[PDB]
Design a protein around this ligand. Structure first.
Ligand SMILES: *[C@@H]1O[C@H](CO)[C@@H](O[C@@H]2O[C@H](CO)[C@@H](O)[C@H](O)[C@H]2NC(C)=O)[C@H](O)[C@H]1NC(C)=O
Ligand SMILES: *[C@@H]1O[C@H](CO)[C@@H](O[C@@H]2O[C@H](CO)[C@@H](O)[C@H](O)[C@H]2NC(C)=O)[C@H](O)[C@H]1NC(C)=O
Ligand SMILES: *[C@@H]1O[C@H](CO)[C@@H](O)[C@H](O)[C@H]1NC(C)=O
Ligand SMILES: *[C@@H]1O[C@H](CO)[C@@H](O)[C@H](O)[C@H]1NC(C)=O
Ligand SMILES: *[C@@H]1O[C@H](CO)[C@@H](O)[C@H](O)[C@H]1NC(C)=O
Ligand SMILES: N[C@@H](CCCC[NH3+])C(=O)O
Ligand SMILES: [Zn+2]
Length: 869
């Protein structure tokens, strides 16, 4: 079957035929930034394997005005082809008047043209405010995973790699960047210019990139030669200094660690005004949101720095993981993304150990654990089809779990061995693709008895959920039962490595596992044991017997006798099992007593995080009695440390993080003093007409405070537009979402639609923010529900944007009622809407909420009332 206008389609599967193999693209693009469109011409050197009468490749909203196939041997320049367009598979078929012949190299060549894109996809238009207040346009690309086909027709699968020779034509007011460095620039008749770029190494289509803009740069050189350059609005070249330092340090590290030089002469990182993802790893031309790449010590904070450091790291890691060695297909996307999410950890701890990213990392896992503890979860490695499924593939599973199980795996195998493991892997696939299994093999092979590692990871990657490992203590024999962990199954088995210490020697007893059930003996009767040291393992431990109580009392006596990640980890599981139903809320709440002794901010903050979480539940629902005693228990306890915090920016990262943490908790809870001081700094800053410097750490706090008066709110929105700091704007906007006036917030949400004052790219994040506040949880839900039509014009489902606009506004619900209006909306979404897996997840989550409450709510009230006495 087929289309468009009559005539039939030679190929009826959404994948492409292996027959016609692409070897090289010649790619010319003539964009116009006034006309706001482009004209283009390409020339693909094919290579048939089996003779055939028709050629098949991808194309999308591309008008093709000339199709030929020249011969190199058959025929002299050059026969014309018949173009068949099948949209519902975003394919076009070429028609030859003469079947081709195996083992022969041809040249398919077409002329095409389109308008510059609307969205955040393909070859699209973006703008930005100068310091003068001028709006300015530029042209940029985003091809992952299925969008190179909207830019130039091609074989848009990650497996069909090729060389790419791009030529860009431009006004003299602009510059052109692309993956490779610029060979030359010729002038043209009318004073037009044409840039020629080094031919790329073999590489997938989704990684091709080109850009026209009038940006400025800071350049530098990695010790191994490469010219790193940070590109941004000319008014912003200052914020690009950190980006440069770190890129440099990082590329240096990577080359050494991976023991593979980065192939290209140059590496550019550019800060795109309008950019949907946080960044795109385009080889030699990595795009970023300004908030991922730009840093301004006046406005950028502890966390900020850490995060931009983080995404720069993550993106440079891609130059190897993904770029050099590309997964064969979007099912094992995780291979690219989990390994990159992981290498984050390594390289930053490596180069910037002061950022102390390690103590953080776990959160990456804790958070995936939250989503993996549902039935609506999935296997890191899964079948993928429609472009939409592919997009759905980009999530916490592929990213975080992937990064976590790898980390676990590195524990079982050790750095030096794991490092070797990857060096090999990379080199064995340089400039090509690799399969899920391919990786395991290259790792597990780093006598004469065998590293069976495969089995282990193979269960991890290919099935849902996360293991719960209950342990029973009877003198010197410990019962081990492994279950699928869920949050209130049958058929899951994990080769889950175990770890554990005892109250005795602080030494790490290891021991694998691969059966539904096993047992182990303890060399000496001991107080307590703690399985999964440092929490380096992707699983949970439940302590039946006095196992739980023993650990908790240990925490109140001499807690330092516990690893600070054990502490952290413990806190985590305790509260999770309370949701599992296996524990009762009082036990967890009781752990939170030792927190007055806890100096590991990691733990101190995690504990606090949960207490904080409960107050917020109570607050949304009207539950005034609990939320107010919780506020009180929070102010009173912790008032020691709360009152120890300086409205400054001194101390280590965690010291700063802790400061902002607490001081927020304080102002959020209305601690008169703090909320007065904050009030002060703002009125000062505002009336000093911006001259006064609020410390970046308390920055959000002050802004969010000053936003309570319509006087301040109106100054901040005014202040927002003029700002040159992506980072400051972020914080202003946040502070804007802390108003209590419906229309005020409503305004924001609408300005997000508009997308002229507040870029649409923020629409999700913003919505999410408002839905959080009790005031706006309704507004938001209303809006999304009402505007799902126009929303879907602006974004794709399932774009991460749409995906999070959905959950962000609903995932926090906890009533039977809300759970229907959602359930119902998801039914409604069921023309073009249905279906996103997030539809399930969202519900599974709202049920878990109602449950957790009806289950554990009464327990909360008494537990608190108890303290009051
Ligand atoms: C895109 O088209 C624009 C129209 O805005 C081009 O500019 C006109 O081009 C002709 C030939 O260069 C000139 O005679 C006019 O003076 C231009 N008008 C303006 C307002 O500049 C522009 O060259 C194109 N952009 C590119 C370089 O591709
Ligand atoms: C297309 O890309 C390849 C690399 O993917 C270019 O280079 C060859 O790559 C191998 C493998 O790393 C190197 O060892 C060789 O030095 C390169 N060979 C050559 C030709 O020098 C290759 O040159 C590119 N081909 C085109 C069409 O330019
Ligand atoms: C191409 O040829 C190979 C070997 O001759 C064969 O395995 C394959 O089926 C052919 N492709 C098709 C489906 O025509
Ligand atoms: C982090 O780096 C330090 C040295 O810089 C090292 O001791 C530690 O092993 C690293 N953490 C891991 C396991 O990556
Ligand atoms: C636990 O507490 C004691 C006294 O309260 C303290 O001096 C001791 O150093 C702590 N134990 C350890 C090993 O830190
Ligand atoms: N690969 C990108 C995500 C971009 C996906 C959408 N273009 C990253 O590392 O975050
Ligand atoms: Zn990535």
């Amino acid at each position: 079957p087929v289309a468009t206008n009559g005539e039939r389609f030679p190929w009826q599967e959404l994948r492409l035929p292996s027959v016609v193999i692409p070897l090289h693209y010649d790619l010319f693009v003539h964009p116009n930034l006034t006309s706001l469109d482009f004209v283009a011409s390409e020339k693909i050197e094919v290579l048939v394997s089996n003779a055939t009468q028709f050629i098949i490749l991808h194309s999308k909203d591309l008008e093709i005005t000339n199709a030929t196939l020249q011969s190199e041997e058959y025929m002299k320049p050059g026969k014309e082809l018949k173009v068949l367009s099948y949209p519902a598979h975003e394919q076009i078929a070429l028609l030859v008047p003469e079947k081709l012949t195996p083992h022969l190299k041809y040249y398919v060549a077409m002329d095409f043209q389109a308008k510059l894109g609307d969205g955040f996809e393909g070859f699209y238009k973006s703008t930005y405010r100068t310091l003068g207040g001028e709006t300015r346009i530029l042209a940029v690309t985003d091809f992952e995973p299925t969008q190179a086909r909207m830019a130039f027709p091609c074989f848009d699968e990650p497996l069909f790699k090729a060389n790419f020779s791009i030529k860009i034509r431009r006004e003299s007011r602009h510059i052109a960047l692309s993956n490779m460095p610029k060979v030359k620039t010729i002038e043209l008749e009318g004073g037009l210019l044409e840039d020629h770029f080094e031919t790329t190494v073999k590489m997938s289509t989704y990684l091709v990139a080109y850009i026209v803009c009038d940006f400025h740069s800071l350049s530098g050189f990695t010790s191994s030669g490469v010219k790193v350059s940070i590109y941004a609005s000319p008014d912003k070249r200052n914020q690009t200094h950190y980006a440069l330092q770190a890129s440099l340090k990082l590329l240096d590290f990577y080359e050494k660690y991976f023991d593979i030089y980065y192939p290209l002469s140059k590496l550019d990182l550019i800060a795109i005004p309008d950019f949907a993802p946080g960044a795109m790893e385009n080889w030699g031309l990595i795009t970023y949101r300004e908030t991922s790449l730009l840093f301004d010590p006046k406005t950028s904070s502890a966390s900020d720095k850490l995060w931009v450091t983080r995404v720069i790291a993550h993106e440079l890691a891609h130059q190897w993981f993904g770029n050099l060695v590309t997964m064969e297909w979007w099912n094992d996307i995780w291979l690219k993304e989990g390994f990159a999410k992981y290498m984050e950890l390594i390289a930053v701890n490596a180069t910037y150990p002061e950022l102390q990213f390690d103590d953080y990392f776990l959160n990456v896992c804790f958070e995936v654990i939250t989503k993996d503890s549902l039935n609506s979860s999935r296997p890191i490695s899964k079948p993928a089809e429609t472009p939409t499924q592919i997009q759905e593939m980009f999530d916490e599973v592929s990213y975080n779990k992937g990064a976590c199980i790898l980390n676990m795996l590195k524990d079982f195998l050790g750095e030096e061995k794991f490092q070797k493991g990857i060096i090999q892997y990379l080199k064995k696939f340089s400039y090509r693709n690799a399969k899920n299994d391919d990786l395991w093999s290259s790792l597990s092979n780093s006598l004469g008895e065998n590293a069976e590692v495969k089995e282990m990871m193979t269960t991890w990657t290919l099935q849902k959920g996360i293991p719960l490992l209950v342990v029973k203590q009877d003198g010197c024999s410990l019962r081990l039962q492994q279950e699928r962990f869920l949050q209130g199954q049958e058929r899951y088995l994990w080769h889950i490595p175990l770890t554990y210490s005892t109250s005795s020697s602080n030494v790490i007893h290891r021991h694998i596992l691969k059966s539904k059930t096993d047992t182990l003996d303890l060399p000496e009767k001991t107080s307590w044991v703690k399985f999964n040291v440092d929490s380096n393992g992707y699983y949970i431990v439940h302590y039946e017997g006095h196992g739980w109580d023993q650990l908790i009392t240990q925490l109140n006596q001499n807690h330092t006798l516990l690893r600070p990640k054990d502490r952290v980890g413990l806190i985590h599981d305790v509260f999770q099992l309370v949701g599992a139903g296996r524990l009762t809320l009082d036990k967890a709440l009781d752990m939170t007593y030792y927190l007055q002794h806890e100096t590991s901010s990691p733990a101190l903050l995690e504990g606090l995080s949960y207490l904080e979480s409960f107050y917020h539940m109570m607050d949304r629902r009207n539950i005034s009695d609990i939320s107010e005693n919780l506020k009180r228990y929070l102010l009173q306890y912790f008032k020691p440390v709360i009152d120890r915090q300086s409205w400054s920016d001194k101390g280590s990262v965690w010291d700063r993080m802790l400061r902002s943490a607490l001081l927020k908790l304080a102002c959020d809870l209305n601690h008169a003093p703090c909320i007065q001081k904050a009030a002060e700094l703002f009125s000062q800053w505002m009336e000093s007409s911006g001259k006064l410097n609020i410390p970046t750490d308390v920055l959000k706090i002050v802004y969010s405070v000053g936003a309570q008066t319509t006087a301040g709110w109106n100054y901040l929105l005014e202040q927002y537009e003029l700002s040159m700091s992506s980072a400051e704007q972020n914080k202003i906007l946040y502070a804007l979402s802390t108003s209590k006036h419906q229309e005020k917030l409503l305004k924001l949400i609408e300005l997000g639609m508009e997308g002229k004052v507040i870029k649409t790219q923020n629409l999700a994040a913003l919505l999410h923010a408002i839905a959080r506040r009790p005031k706006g949880q309704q507004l938001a839900w209303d809006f999304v529900r009402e505007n799902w039509t126009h929303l879907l014009k602006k974004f794709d489902l399932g774009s991460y944007d749409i995906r999070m606009i959905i959950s962000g506004t609903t995932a926090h619900f906890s009533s039977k009622d809300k759970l229907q209006e959602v359930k119902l909306f998801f039914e409604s979404l069921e023309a073009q809407g249905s279906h996103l897996d997030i539809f399930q997840t969202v519900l599974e989550t709202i049920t878990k909420n109602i449950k957790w409450l009806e289950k554990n709510l009464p327990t909360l009230r008494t537990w608190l009332m108890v303290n009051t006495r």
